Amino acid sequence: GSHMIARIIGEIGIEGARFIEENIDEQFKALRYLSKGIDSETFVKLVIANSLVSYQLTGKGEQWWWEFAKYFYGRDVKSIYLAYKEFLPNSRFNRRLIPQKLSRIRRVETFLSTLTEERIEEYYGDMSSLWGSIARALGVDKESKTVVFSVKMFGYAARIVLSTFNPYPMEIPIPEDSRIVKLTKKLTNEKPRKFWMKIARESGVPPLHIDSILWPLLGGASIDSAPPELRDKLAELIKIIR
DNA sequence: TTTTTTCT
DNA sequence: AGAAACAAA
Question: Which partner for A234 in A36, A110, A223, A238 could form a disulfide, CB atoms 3.0-4.6 Å apart?
Answer without folding.
Answer: A223
